[PDB]
Design a protein around this nucleic acid. Structure first.
Ligand code: ZN
Ligand code: ZN
Ligand code: ZN
Ligand code: ZN
Lengths: 49, 44, 289, 132, 55, 55, 50, 64, 48, 99
RNA sequence: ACACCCAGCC
C-alpha cells in the first residue's frame, strides 16, 4: 500500500508512446500526436478577456 | 442468417435456436457468409 | 437521475468514466467505480446451497508448526454442512459418471442443475443420492436431444434399471415438468458409430426406422428394439456385416427381442429402404431367422 | 540520428513492409448457473440494462457481426446477454484505438459443448513513423 | 481517378528517373578520396589514363 | 474467395498502370468535379469478374 | 491483547463483480468468516460446558 | 506471398515478369541471363524478382 | 533529392535484408484523462 | 480544451535516474503517432530511438504549470549541479558534421 | 481480480 499506492500511484492526464527524432524542433519543444492532444485536456478559467 | 459448413461449402439457413450442425454432412463448424453490405477500399 | 431530465436513462462513458445524461450532456453523479479486475477468493460454485466462506490450513513449515510427536498442531477441520458435503459428493460422482461415456460438460452442468433443484425441493430424501444423480443424468441427456438408454446410464452406475427408472418417474413428478418422447432416430448415431458402420448405412438406418415407425408397422415396441432391428436389417444390405451378438451387446437388446423385431419388419423389406441406396446385397437375399 | 530510419514513402505506397494484423476474439455461451443464462442475441435498450455509448447496430439477428463489416474503437462484435435473476449486457468490445474489418466469424461447439464463437478482425498495418 | 505522385506512388508515371550532371568532376561537387578507383560515367569524356577532369 | 484478403487485392489493383496518353488532360480531378461521388467526366469504371472452375 | 477484533469496512475488503453473476469476496472476508465460525464454536462450547 | 506488381524502389513493373522468369529458368537459363533477358537492368528490380518466394502456390493447395 | 546537388561524400548503398518487428507504434500509443478507476484504491486502472 | 501548441508538459523517461530525467517541454502538434524530441535532449534522458517509450504528464492547474515553466523546463536544466557541466550537448550527426 | 509465462526499454 505505502510504496505501491501512496508514494507512487497511477495518475490521470498522462500519455505514453514511442519517441522518434526531430532535429527541426527546439530543445524545449516536444512533438505530440494529434490523438494524444485531442484526448487529454487542460482546464482554462473563463475570463472577460 | 446464412452459414457455410467448413467441410462441404453448403449454405445453411439456421435460426437462432437450432444447435449448430450441417444438414448435408453433420460437421460442427460453421462460417458466417460475407455480408451483402458494400465496403469500400481505397487501393492506396 | 438527471435533475433536469429525471426520466432519461444515463449512459456509461467508460472511456471518460462518467454517468452522462444523453439529453443535456450533464455529467450526473460521480466518477464511475468500475467493478471488475485491476487478493480475491475462489469462484464459489453457484450450485452450492450455502456460502461456504472458509479457508484451508497449509502444510507445516517449521518446528513451531509441529507438535511433540510428529504431528501438526493445526489441522484441516472443515466447517462444511452435512448437506453441502453430501451434494458435493454427488456432483463429484455425477462428473465421474458422465466422463465414463464421454458426455460433454454442458450435460454435466444440466445434471448438476437438476440435482440441485431436486435436492432443494426435498421430496426424495429416502432414495440414494447416487440413484437421484443417475436419474438426473438421464433427464439431462434426454432434454438436450441426445438421449441415452436406461441400460446405458445403468452401465456407468451402481444403481439398477429398476431403481433409476423409479427415481426418474419420481423426479419428473416432483419437478412438474415433462420430456420429449424418444424417437428411433436419436439412438441411431451412437448405436451405429460404436458398431463401425459407413455413413450411407447411417442414412439408410435412420430413414428406414423413421418410415417403419411412421406407418405404424411395429405396435408398441420400444424405440431401442426398432432402432436395433433397423441397424441389423440395414447392415446386411451393405458390405459391412454385423451379427446378433454385437448389435445386442451394443444396444442393450436381447436376441429374442431383436429376432422378433426382425421377423416383424422383414415382409415390408423393399418398400422401406431409401430409393437412392447402393444395394450391395439383393433385397431378397436377407436371411430370415 | 540515434538508431532511427528514414523510409521511402513511395516504397511504402508500393507495398514495402506493409503487413496485416489478425486478432481473434473468442466468446462462449454458458448455462452453468441454475437460473442465469447467457445467450447470443442482438440486445435492445428497451429490454437489456447494462449497455454503454457504443453502437449495437452492426450486429446481425444472431448477435454476431457479419464478415466484411468495418469496425472501429468501441464497436460491438458479439451480442451476449445474461438473464438477470430483465437481462444484463456482457458483450465483447473492440480494443481501444484498433480499427479493422471482420474477416471470418466461426460458430461451433467447444470442448464443453457450449456454443462457441470466434471472430477474426483483420487490420492492415502500413509502416508509419515509429514502427521498429 | 486522376492523381499525381505526391499523393501516392500509384500515380507515379516514371520507373526511375536517372539524372546526372558534370560526369567528370570539373566542379568537384563530389570529392573522391581515391579517384582512380571510381568507374567512369557513361557520359564521361576522358581517356583511360585520366581519372577525373581538372578542377 | 481467393487466398488474398480484400485490401491486398485492392492494393495490387491500384498499382496496375493504365494507359493515360490523351484522356488524362480531358479528365478532371474527382475533388473538383461537380458530380456527387463519381462520373465519366472525372473517373473511369473497371470491372473484374473471374471464376475458376477448371482443374 | 486482542479482546475485541475490529472488522474492516466493505471498502477495505470489497467484493468484485465478474462476468455473469458472481459475488467473489476478498481474502479478508473469508478470514472474517473463519473468525466468526470459530468464535461461535468456542462460545457454544463454553456455553454448554465442553 | 505473390510477386509485387511494382518494384518497391523505382516503380518498374515486375508483376508481369514472374511467370516469364520461371519459364526462362525452366529453359536452363542461369538467373543472371534470365534477369537480363527480361529487361531488368537496375539491381533493385533484379533484387525484386530474384529474391521473391511464390508462397501463393503453396497457399492454393488447401481447399477453399 | 531536394536540390539535385551531388553529395560531397559518396554514400555506401546496397541491398540488405531488413525485417519488420511486431513492436508497432499504433499498438503502443496511449493516453488518459479521467478514465475509469479501480475498486480498492479508487485510482486509475492498470494498462492501455 | 484540447491541449494545443505552447502547452507545458513534463516529459519523462524511465528509469528516472537523475533530476534532468523529468524536464518540461512545450507541446507542438505534429501529424504522426510518435513523440518527437530534439537530439540534444536525448543525452539527459539517456534515450535512443530504437523503440524507447516516454511518458508525458500534462499539468492541470495554473500554479503547477507556472512552476514547471519556471523551475524544470529544458533550457533551465542545461547545466546540472551534479558535476557543474552542461548535461546536454551536440551529438551524433550534428557533432560529426560540425567537426 | 489472482497467478504464471513471454516480451519491450535501460
Ligand atoms: Zn457440411
Ligand atoms: Zn439531463
Ligand atoms: Zn465527376
Ligand atoms: Zn526497380
Amino acid at each position: 500500500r505505502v510504496r505501491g499506492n501512496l508514494m507512487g500511484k497511477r495518475v490521470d492526464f498522462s500519455a505514453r508512446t514511442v519517441i522518434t527524432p526531430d532535429p527541426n524542433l527546439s530543445i524545449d519543444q516536444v512533438g505530440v500526436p494529434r490523438s494524444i492532444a485531442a484526448n487529454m485536456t487542460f482546464a482554462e478559467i473563463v475570463t472577460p478577456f | 442468417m446464412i452459414y457455410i459448413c467448413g467441410e462441404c461449402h453448403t449454405e445453411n439457413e439456421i435460426k437462432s435456436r437450432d444447435p449448430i450442425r450441417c444438414r448435408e454432412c453433420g460437421y460442427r463448424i460453421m462460417y458466417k457468409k460475407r455480408t451483402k453490405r458494400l465496403v469500400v477500399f481505397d487501393a492506396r | 437521475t438527471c435533475p433536469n431530465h429525471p426520466d432519461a436513462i444515463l449512459v456509461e462513458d467508460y472511456r471518460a468514466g462518467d454517468m452522462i445524461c444523453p439529453e443535456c450532456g450533464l455529467v450526473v453523479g460521480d466518477r464511475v467505480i468500475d467493478v471488475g479486475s485491476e487478493r480475491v477468493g475462489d469462484s464459489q460454485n453457484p450450485l452450492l446451497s450455502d456460502g461456504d466462506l472458509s479457508t484451508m490450513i497449509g502444510k507445516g513449515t517449521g518446528a513451531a508448526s509441529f507438535d511433540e510427536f510428529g504431528n501438526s498442531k493445526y489441522q484441516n477441520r472443515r466447517t462444511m454442512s452435512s448437506s453441502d458435503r453430501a451434494m458435493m459428493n454427488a456432483f463429484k460422482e455425477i462428473t465421474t459418471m458422465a466422463d465414463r461415456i464421454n458426455l460433454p460438460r454442458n450435460i454435466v452442468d444440466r445434471t448438476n442443475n437438476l440435482f440441485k433443484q431436486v435436492y432443494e425441493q426435498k421430496s426424495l430424501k429416502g432414495r440414494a443420492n447416487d440413484a437421484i444423480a443417475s436419474a438426473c443424468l438421464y433427464i439431462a441427456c434426454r432434454q438436450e436431444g441426445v438421449p441415452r438408454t436406461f441400460k446405458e446410464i445403468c452401465a456407468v452406475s451402481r444403481i439398477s434399471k429398476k431403481e433409476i427408472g423409479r427415481c426418474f418417474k419420481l423426479i419428473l413428478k416432483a419437478l412438474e415438468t415433462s420430456v420429449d418422447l424418444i424417437t428411433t432416430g436419436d439412438f441411431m448415431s451412437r448405436f451405429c458409430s460404436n458398431l463401425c458402420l459407413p455413413k450411407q448405412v447411417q442414412m439408410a438406418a435412420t430413414h428406414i426406422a423413421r418410415k417403419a415407425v411412421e406407418l405404424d408397422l411395429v405396435p408398441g415396441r420400444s424405440p431401442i428394439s426398432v432402432a436395433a432391428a433397423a441397424i441389423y436389417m440395414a447392415s446386411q444390405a451393405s458390405a459391412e456385416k454385423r451379427t446378433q451378438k454385437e448389435i445386442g451387446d451394443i444396444a442393450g437388446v436381447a436376441d429374442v427381442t431383436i429376432r422378433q423385431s426382425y421377423r416383424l419388419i422383414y415382409p415390408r423389406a423393399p418398400d422401406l429402404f431409401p430409393t437412392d441406396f447402393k444395394f450391395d446385397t439383393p433385397v431378397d437375399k436377407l436371411p430370415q431367422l | 540520428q540515434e538508431d532511427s530510419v528514414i523510409m521511402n514513402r513511395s516504397a511504402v505506397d508500393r507495398g514495402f513492409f506493409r503487413s496485416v494484423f489478425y486478432r481473434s476474439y473468442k466468446e462462449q455461451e454458458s448455462k452453468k448457473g441454475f437460473d442465469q443464462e447467457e445467450v447470443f442475441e442482438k440486445p435492445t435498450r428497451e429490454t437489456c440494462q447494462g449497455m454503454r455509448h457504443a453502437i449495437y447496430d452492426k450486429l446481425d439477428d444472431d448477435g454476431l457481426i457479419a464478415p466484411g463489416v468495418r469496425v472501429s474503437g468501441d464497436d460491438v462484435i458479439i451480442g451476449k446477454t445474461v438473464t438477470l435473476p430483465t437481462k444484463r449486457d456482457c458483450s465483447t468490445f473492440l480494443r481501444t484505438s484498433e480499427t479493422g474489418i471482420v474477416d471470418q466469424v466461426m460458430v461451433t461447439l467447444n470442448q464443453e459443448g457450449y456454443k462457441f464463437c470466434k471472430i477474426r478482425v483483420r487490420s492492415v498495418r502500413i509502416p508509419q513513423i515509429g514502427d521498429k | 481517378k486522376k492523381g499525381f505522385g505526391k499523393e501516392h506512388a500509384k500515380w507515379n508515371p516514371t520507373a526511375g528517373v536517372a539524372f546526372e550532371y558534370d560526369p567528370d568532376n570539373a566542379l568537384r561537387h563530389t570529392v573522391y578520396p581515391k579517384p582512380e578507383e571510381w568507374p567512369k560515367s557513361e557520359y564521361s569524356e576522358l581517356d583511360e589514363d585520366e581519372s577525373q577532369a581538372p578542377y | 474467395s481467393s487466398v488474398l484478403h480484400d485490401e491486398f487485392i485492392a492494393h495490387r489493383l491500384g498499382l496496375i498502370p493504365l494507359t493515360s496518353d490523351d484522356i488524362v488532360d480531358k479528365l478532371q480531378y474527382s475533388r473538383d468535379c461537380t458530380c456527387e461521388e463519381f462520373c465519366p467526366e472525372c473517373s473511369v469504371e473497371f470491372t473484374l469478374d473471374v471464376r475458376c472452375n477448371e482443374d | 491483547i486482542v479482546t475485541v477484533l475490529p472488522v474492516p469496512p466493505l471498502s477495505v475488503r470489497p467484493a468484485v463483480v465478474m462476468q455473469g453473476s458472481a459475488r467473489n469476496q476478498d481474502d479478508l472476508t473469508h478470514k472474517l468468516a473463519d473468525i466468526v465460525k470459530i468464535n461461535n464454536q468456542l462460545r457454544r462450547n463454553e456455553q454448554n460446558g465442553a | 506471398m505473390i510477386i509485387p506488381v511494382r518494384c518497391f524502389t523505382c516503380g518498374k513493373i515486375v508483376g508481369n515478369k514472374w511467370e516469364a522468369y520461371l519459364g526462362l529458368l525452366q529453359a536452363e537459363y542461369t538467373e543472371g541471363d534470365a534477369l537480363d533477358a527480361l529487361g531488368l537492368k537496375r539491381y533493385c528490380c533484379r533484387r525484386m524478382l530474384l529474391a521473391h518466394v511464390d508462397l501463393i502456390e503453396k497457399l492454393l493447395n488447401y481447399a477453399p | 533529392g531536394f536540390t539535385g546537388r551531388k553529395i560531397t561524400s559518396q554514400i555506401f548503398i546496397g541491398p540488405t535484408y531488413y525485417q519488420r518487428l511486431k513492436h508497432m507504434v499504433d499498438d503502443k500509443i496511449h493516453s488518459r484523462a479521467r478514465g475509469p478507476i479501480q475498486i480498492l484504491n479508487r485510482q486509475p486502472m492498470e494498462g492501455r | 480544451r484540447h491541449m494545443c501548441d505552447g502547452d507545458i508538459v513534463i516529459f519523462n523517461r524511465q528509469p528516472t535516474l537523475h533530476k534532468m530525467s523529468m524536464m518540461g517541454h512545450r507541446v507542438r502538434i505534429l501529424p504522426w503517432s510518435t513523440f518527437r524530441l530534439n537530439l540534444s535532449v536525448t543525452t539527459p534522458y539517456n534515450a535512443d530511438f530504437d523503440g524507447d517509450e516516454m511518458n508525458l504528464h500534462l499539468p492541470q492547474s495554473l500554479e503547477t504549470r507556472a512552476e514547471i515553466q519556471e523551475l524544470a523546463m529544458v533550457p533551465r536544466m542545461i547545466v546540472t549541479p551534479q558535476s557543474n557541466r552542461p548535461v546536454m550537448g551536440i551529438v551524433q550527426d550534428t557533432l560529426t558534421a560540425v567537426r
